[PDB]
Amino acid sequence: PSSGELWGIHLMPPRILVECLLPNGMIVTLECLREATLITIKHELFKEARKYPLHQLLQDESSYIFVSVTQEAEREEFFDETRRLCDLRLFQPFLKVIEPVGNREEKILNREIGFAIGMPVCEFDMVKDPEVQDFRRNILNVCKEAVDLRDLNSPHSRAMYVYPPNVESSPELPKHIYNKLDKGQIIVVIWVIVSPNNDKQKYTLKINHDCVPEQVIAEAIRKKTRSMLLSSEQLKLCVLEYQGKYILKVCGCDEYFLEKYPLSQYKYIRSCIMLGRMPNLMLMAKESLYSQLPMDCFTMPSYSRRISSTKSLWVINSALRIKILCATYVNVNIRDIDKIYVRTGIYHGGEPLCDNVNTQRVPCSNPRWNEWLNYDIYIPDLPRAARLCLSICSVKGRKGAKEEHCPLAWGNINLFDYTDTLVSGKMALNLWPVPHGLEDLLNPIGVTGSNPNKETPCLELEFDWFSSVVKFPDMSVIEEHANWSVSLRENDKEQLKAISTRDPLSEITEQEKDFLWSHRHYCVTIPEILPKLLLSVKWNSRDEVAQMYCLVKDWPPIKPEQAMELLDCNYPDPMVRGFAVRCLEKYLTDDKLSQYLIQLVQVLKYEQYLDNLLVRFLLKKALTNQRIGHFFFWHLKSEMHNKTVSQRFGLLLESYCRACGMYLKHLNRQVEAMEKLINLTDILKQEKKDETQKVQMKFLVEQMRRPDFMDALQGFLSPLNPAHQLGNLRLEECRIMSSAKRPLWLNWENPDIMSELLFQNNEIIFKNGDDLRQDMLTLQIIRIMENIWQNQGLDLRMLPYGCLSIGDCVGLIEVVRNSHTIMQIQCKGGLKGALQFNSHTLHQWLKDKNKGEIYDAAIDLFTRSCAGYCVATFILGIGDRHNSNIMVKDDGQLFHIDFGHFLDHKKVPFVLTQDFLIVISKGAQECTKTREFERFQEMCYKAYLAIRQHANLFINLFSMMLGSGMPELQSFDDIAYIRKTLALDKTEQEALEYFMKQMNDAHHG
Amino acid sequence: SLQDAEWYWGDISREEVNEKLRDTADGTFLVRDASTKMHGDYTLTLRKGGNNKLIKIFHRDGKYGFSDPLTFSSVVELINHYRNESLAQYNPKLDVKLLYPVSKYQQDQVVKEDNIEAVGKKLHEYNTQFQEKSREYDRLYEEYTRTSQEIQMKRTAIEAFNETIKIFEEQCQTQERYSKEYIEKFKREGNEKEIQRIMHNYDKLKSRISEIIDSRRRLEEDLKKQAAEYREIDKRMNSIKPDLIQLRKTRDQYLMWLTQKGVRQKKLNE
Ligand SMILES: N#Cc1c(-c2cc(NC(=O)c3cc(F)cc(C(F)(F)F)c3)c3c(c2)C(=O)N[C@H]3c2cc(F)ccc2Cl)ccc2ncnn12
């Protein structure tokens, strides 16, 4: 959005000459400082203007403002005159003086939104499309609903928005967590700061794990008033005083206990029990917490308020036909390609409603057809979510070899628009590039819409016109048509239930799907069967669709892990997707919403229109819970570059930033912080790439010493976790790394009053050049698998470290402290065989770091985490990793890293190297025959079938990512590998023996 | 026999048959042993309506068929029956004959003396010719994406020049507006000194407007030339795609003569 303070210039010199244009036609060259604020500019300009002709015409300085052109090509009115000259992102150093017009505050706010979302808001105002303008206005009520809802019981409701409780989805902790409680109790330490020098004192408590925070405050004041000789009622008065006057905060980060969940349900304490660590809480004054919550308003924008006979589809008695006119800007070699043609198809999701039809073949030099393509479908039989998918294809011919067809550009069209009207008249859409690796002649999963890029192939069509506007029938007549068309058993019941078990991608033969459609009324007894039944509906028959609409209207709610499937690309019907959303907004916890946010943002792409039930649900939740609103913003912001969604996500971000409150100020600090980092890496990667790594080290330390840089990189919230404050930089520890892209190892101090009780310095890796969303999805999937195992009782410790993509191949990665690669650890040892590292070197290093009684714990943690990653990598095809791809903490926890690096190397067994068996067996001979290894592979077996028991969830999570643009996820065929490792088309014992044989072949026993 | 039938392929995956009925005509059919990997249980898939519709071939008492009433003796009898007349007998919802069979060892386009070098040599040749043309395609797509974002960087920069020029042209049109009748008033007072101050500043204005107008065309000139070579990179990729697919299938089927040995010795050597 801005590579520097001037076009083609990273930083302005300390002094530059600014061309100032006056309201009289006089041009004044003003020398001014790089950092000069516009208040200083305007004052010194009108001070200098007296030296130039026609001064009498100038009104008073205060009656004018500056306007200029930004590097985003925006004529920006600089209302906020406090900004530094060099922060304006000017295209050229000039300023035009004008009288201010319009709402000052709205203009200042739009500039701040534009910086946040990466594009000027004014670009939305120029959009002809009425769907865009209707969207901007019609979701402002979702913003009002959310703002009014969180300003209801101020300041508490406002605190619950900014600092929402970070709690598990269930208070019912499993027994392997409970068994670490001292006879059902937990020990906690409460801290308090005293003013004279911010000295601090602690109070240790033992309490029931399920005490609410106010009860914890009761036990604390009860323990301190021990000897005060208070009566039972005087004790109540001060308990009441403190319960209502103070709250509890986690020492070292911005997490609070503002709601009365049981203490053990807060994730910070659920893990202190799991990890057996000491929960440290700080008693804090509520009036001090509310002090750092400045009131924030939400004002309706200008566009929110003002603006300057049909027949039903089911009366049209004719089959569908569409005219392909001609094409433009087709890039094809006229002597290597024989002919070109337009391929088309009518799609409902991914299933063709009818057979495809193509225009006649045509010479490359004259892309013109003027053909009416006739489709085998009755117009009344069109479903609402019907889409036209087309492409321009080329052919190369040969007799000794088959004729080859290839797509050149694709485009998809909604046959009904967002107002329920069937399209008519001639239309012209610019087509999209065929994504790398796709060879199918059409792309039905791609977005619907014309490519805004210029000089791109433009195809022109014409749709029939039926003498008047045609609209999809209202739901009123749809149900009556079902009453028109519609005019127990045992052995069938076991088969129906036998079909609910099968995964979303299992083969469903014709006899099975029409068998579901036959017993479609009995299916409500097993609501799990709905996705199978919907794929059984013949969507090109208005008789069946209407009958199916009545069933989904009364379908018993399914739980979110199942409803999410109905948001993927195979369920585009708006009634099905509306049912799925209603399942989420009444059964999906903010915990599991935040867990699946990645997939939920991606299915927005499959949505046929801008305004839909899903986006209003996500937007609603993002504005009432600032934790998920933080990542809601970054996941949208990270894909702004992609022109296939830049508008959809851009309009969605505008509404969020316009109603997220004071958190926009914080986000802009994050955005500006990343903008500075990405500009320094680009300079290191584009200019001084040839320089030495020590020359580059200079540019860095020097460019990091700049005051403007440090002020922008010191004192902001971590995008990986806004609860972590990033204070001053420890430049001593900052460095470029050895990778060719040279990522930045960054380290901040933790400014928390009691930072010493969590982590005193926080360090993150910033990488520019690698696509990180493969690591995000893999790490997310690892976190899902760990959550599944823990709740089943398997204490397999995974390490889904923080990873966030913030843009096109740029993002952040959480550093794991006190950890090394297995390769690094082998190098700490010696050579045993002939030029061969010692296999026991790993076991020995782990003993040195865990002397004494803590040795057994480290071996247990290594065997449990090793079992977890062995199963995880096998299932997901991560498999053969290098010793530099695998890491281990001094604690003994093992974890893999850099998964995109691995998938990228390709574009299987699992690792069970001897060095790991030495540790697992505690340094024994024939380690494959001890009883430690006996129970190690027993953990792996239980972990494998545990993930198989939740295979539907993972297949649905991957299916929701097909429209993401990740080359690993371009078709359901890609997802079929997880059906192979999980052996879903076999029985349990067959999958278990498949996993056992796999593990046995790993150690070749 | 069934094992030798044209349209029986055996242990073939669903994703592999989807890759064989792609954009084919209604009636193209093919049978596998069911993905369940259970003996004597099969699945037939035929193209109809642009879809690959699967049906299960039940088996009981040695008979065959794909409905509860079971009749036929062998699958070859079950299939050929529906090759002569339509399968609308089973379900009127689809009424195509099993028209086009796709066989396993047709399209075996290796014609010369089947010396083992037809694998050890010509396979390594095509596979080397396949990975080279793949290297070039990835090289093109890289500089294609680079050129793509460099172009839109320049389109927005000329659009910025358009706004700056729009703002300097309106400046000239306001200089002439508010200076005319002061030039006209100075003219009759005999104050050429003040007129040249105004003109010296007007010249300064339209002197700079010439520089930014030149900087624009110098950019529109770079844009015009980079937009052209961007279209050339596109047509080159479109010429490499069909060839790349042609010799990738040739490299794949030249494993037929590796399957002649079955055990992958003659590629394990490579
Ligand atoms: N590589 C590799 C590889 C494979 C291999 C690996 C993979 N895995 C991923 O793609 C992958 C896994 C993640 F967890 C996250 C991501 C991310 F982030 F992109 F979203 C992507 C798949 C296939 C084959 C295949 O057919 N479908 C792929 C697949 C498998 C699954 F279980 C789940 C999903 C998918 Cl999509 C097999 C053998 C072998 N021998 C040497 N390498 N290697």
Can you walk through the features of this model?
The complex is a heterodimer of chains A (1005) and B (270). By secondary structure, chain A is an alpha+beta fold. Among the domains of chain A are: 1-101, Roll (Ubiquitin-like (UB roll)), CATH 3.10.20; 167-291, Roll (Ubiquitin-like (UB roll)); 327-471, C2 domain (Immunoglobulin-like, Sandwich); 474-588, Phosphatidylinositol 3-kinase, accessory domain (PIK) (Serine Threonine Protein Phosphatase 5, Tetratricopeptide repeat), CATH 1.25.40; 819-1005, Orthogonal Bundle (Phosphatidylinositol 3-kinase Catalytic Subunit, Chain A, Domain 5). Helix content of chain A is 39%, strand content 19%. In chain A, strands 13, 14, 15, 16, 18, 19 and 21 form a 7-stranded antiparallel β-sheet that branches. A 5-stranded mixed β-sheet of chain A has the order 2-1-5-3-4. A 5-stranded mixed β-sheet of chain A has the order 7-6-10-8-9. In chain A, β3 (65-69) and β4 (75-78) form a beta hairpin. Chain B is α+β, with helices and mostly antiparallel strands and 270 residues long. Chain B has 2 domains: 14-106, SHC Adaptor Protein; 117-259, Helix Hairpins (Orthogonal Bundle). Chain B has helices spanning 14-18, 75-84, 117-120, 122-189, 192-253, 256-259, 265-268, and strands at residues 29-33, 42-48, 51-60, 63-65. Chain B has a 4-stranded antiparallel β-sheet, with no helix packed on it. In chain B, β2 (42-48) and β3 (51-60) form a beta hairpin. In chain B, α4 runs antiparallel to α5. The longest helix of chain B is centred in the middle third of the chain and has 68 residues, at 122-189. The two termini of chain B are 37 Å apart. The chains are: A alpha+beta (1005), B alpha+beta (270). The ligand N#Cc1c(-c2cc(NC(=O)c3cc(F)cc(C(F)(F)F)c3)c3c(c2)C(=O)N[C@H]3c2cc(F)ccc2Cl)ccc2ncnn12 is lined by residues 774, 777-778, 781, 875-877, 879-880, 903, 906, 908, 958, 966, 968-969, 974-975, 977-978, 981 of chain A. It is classed as signaling protein,transferase/inhibitor. Keywords: Lipid kinase, signaling protein, TRANSFERASE-INHIBITOR complex. The assembly is dimeric. The entry is titled "Human PI3K p85alpha/p110alpha bound to RLY-2608". Chain A: Phosphatidylinositol 4,5-bisphosphate 3-kinase catalytic subunit alpha isoform. Organism of A: Homo sapiens.
